[PDB]
Write a protein that binds this ligand. Structure first.
Ligand SMILES: *[C@@H]1O[C@H](CO)[C@@H](O[C@@H]2O[C@H](CO)[C@@H](O[C@@H]3O[C@H](CO)[C@@H](O)[C@H](O[C@H]4O[C@H](CO)[C@@H](O)[C@H](O)[C@@H]4O)[C@@H]3O)[C@H](O)[C@H]2NC(C)=O)[C@H](O)[C@H]1NC(C)=O
Ligand SMILES: *[C@@H]1O[C@H](CO)[C@@H](O[C@@H]2O[C@H](CO)[C@@H](O[C@@H]3O[C@H](CO)[C@@H](O)[C@H](O[C@H]4O[C@H](CO)[C@@H](O)[C@H](O)[C@@H]4O)[C@@H]3O)[C@H](O)[C@H]2NC(C)=O)[C@H](O)[C@H]1NC(C)=O
Ligand SMILES: [Cl-]
Lengths: 303, 301
């Protein structure tokens, strides 16, 4: 086994039923060496006596909070977790994958080094989430990640509505304009009732840029039939715009980048003659095939 | 004196002839302490006996490779170098200065942090060159420089063709759009057979930008009198051009920025009426008074 934190350990178990479990020592962190007994949460009563308790673990019933006992008082506790491994493959049962089979969707609204990663859960009961840089060595990328959180947005797939947890992360060393030489390698420690699973992902910020919708969309009726649609760069997006230039796509509708026909405009305004419908605009990084922003739309209504 | 490398030292000497030299101890790095003798390259034969040889140094004859000798075998060697100082001024005699009176001409074809520094030599016989950041401390700029090398191109001044040594350098921390707050402070240690001289230079990359000539100059014959001359940014030049915008100067001739007449154009093409002669174009950084690129020319036909 291997330690995760104070009084918390993780047992690598081969789940194939023909293979035997792993025997593990649990020693009580106390000066005493007589009158030492153990009580598990999974099993009522005492299971073993002596300072060092050696137990075989193959099922979740052999996990949990093992707590010592002497003279009727608790001495020290130790919590165990299981990491399933079937045919030499680590379990991925806590999280729900996306259509693309990945578990960690990460997106960045600018080159500021800040980004956010989201994931889907199979169930929402007694979950603990931690995320940290998976390399943590010279020639790596220092990233500080805040706490995870449930997003109001539920994500629906083939029929089932899965819940989504997101987390905000910030890179420490940041020169926005610098070309990315080495990818950000992240890892997610996911824990449920006693099951331990971790996920990995390596990405460049440049490859996960998704700008925000253009701001202050204006629809100024100019000519009897024509209207000037205007907008501005999103306040979120990186400055200076002279370097971080977004190109925009204009569309007309009758009430990832999805391109079903649109006229390209790199300026922040365009005249259009629609006479009914809705004018919509999405933004994209000009010099890179980054994901496009969500459409911002105005109704076509002329004087 | 002060050490430069293993068994190589440098003596600061006041060259004025009325001032006395500097006495320096040279001890042989050997356990033995008897039968120790010294042989210099400057002087044939033995000069001193004993483990510690104390010698006065004022001329180059008092420099060179002092080598020990015991029982017919060499023990250890020590090489000395001189840094002349006349009227409290350090010598600058190895290098030849440029037209601008500076010794280290440094230029950058883009903002990539890469640049190259060149210098001229008075003579080319037994030269050793080293170049490094002259500050190399917090509040400095980390730069890694490769080896120097002689350029086939000779540079002629007044009648004399001086040879040119160049070196390629790369800054480690490079943040393109960030404004340069502190200059790159470089230094060049130059040695000729026994003379030690060092040179310094402090510059911003923004101040040494010299683009390359515009590429693919074309002459499209227009209708009735005009011809459209076109060109493109140099592949060397920094991307994205929307930020790094070059302005061009076009001129026509019938045969540092040197201007005997040229009209400014910021686009990559212009109509002109020359009918014989040559159309030429040079590039310059739009937002800064950087040095202009060399002229690219096509014959007007
Ligand atoms: C993702 O999951 C995998 C699989 O669960 C996980 O790999 C395992 O990580 C542990 C912890 O790093 C490894 O255990 C180590 O094993 C060696 C040799 O047996 C021991 O020497 C280590 O202990 C010493 O060093 C530690 C660190 O200095 C100390 O904490 C400790 O007190 C000892 O001094 C340690 O027990 C285990 O071998 C791997 N197994 C495999 C097959 O990969 C991976 O780390 C997880 N990653 C994340 C980001 O969650
Ligand atoms: C350009 O050339 C000039 C002139 O040669 C040069 O100035 C001199 O630099 C030397 C560098 O060694 C200075 O010498 C030091 O002097 C102090 C006090 O006397 C000593 O303590 C120093 O010795 C330490 O370092 C030695 C080598 O590691 C150790 O062996 C020793 O034990 C000490 O730790 C050292 O000798 C000298 O003082 C200056 N001159 C002046 C006027 O101050 C200049 O540095 C050169 N610049 C460049 C960019 O090349
Ligand atoms: Cl991703």
């Amino acid at each position: 086994m291997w330690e995760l934190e104070k009084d918390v350990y993780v047992v690598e178990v081969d789940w194939t039923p023909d293979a035997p479990g792993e025997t593990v020592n649990l020693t009580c962190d106390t000066p005493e060496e007589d009158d030492i007994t153990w009580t598990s949460d999974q099993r009522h009563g005492v299971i073993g006596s002596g300072k060092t308790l050696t137990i075989t673990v193959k099922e979740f019933l052999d996990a949990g909070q093992y707590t010592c006992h002497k003279g009727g008082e608790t001495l020290s506790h130790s919590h165990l977790l299981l990491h399933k491994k079937e045919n030499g493959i680590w379990s991925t049962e806590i999280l729900k994958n996306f259509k693309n089979k990945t578990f960690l969707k990460c997106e960045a609204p600018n080159y500021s080094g800040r980004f956010t990663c989201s994931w889907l859960v199979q169930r929402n009961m007694d979950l603990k989430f931690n995320i940290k840089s998976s390399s943590s060595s010279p020639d790596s990328r220092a990233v500080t990640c805040g706490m995870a959180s449930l997003s109001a947005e539920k994500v629906t797939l083939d029929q089932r509505d899965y819940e989504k947890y997101s987390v905000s992360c910030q890179e420490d060393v940041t020169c926005p304009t610098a070309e990315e030489t080495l990818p950000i390698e992240l890892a997610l420690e996911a824990r449920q009732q006693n099951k331990y699973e971790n996920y990995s992902t390596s990405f460049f910020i440049r490859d996960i840029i998704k700008p925000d919708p253009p701001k202050n969309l204006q629809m100024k009726p100019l000519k009897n039939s024509q209207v000037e649609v205007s907008w501005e760069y999103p306040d979120s997006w990186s400055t200076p715009h002279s370097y971080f230039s977004l190109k925009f796509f204009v569309r007309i509708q009758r009430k990832g980048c999805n391109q079903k026909g649109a006229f390209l405009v790199e300026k922040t305004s365009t005249e259009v003659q629609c006479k009914g419908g809705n004018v919509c605009v999405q933004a994209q990084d000009r010099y890179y095939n980054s994901s496009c922003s969500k459409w911002a739309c105005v109704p076509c209504r002329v004087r």
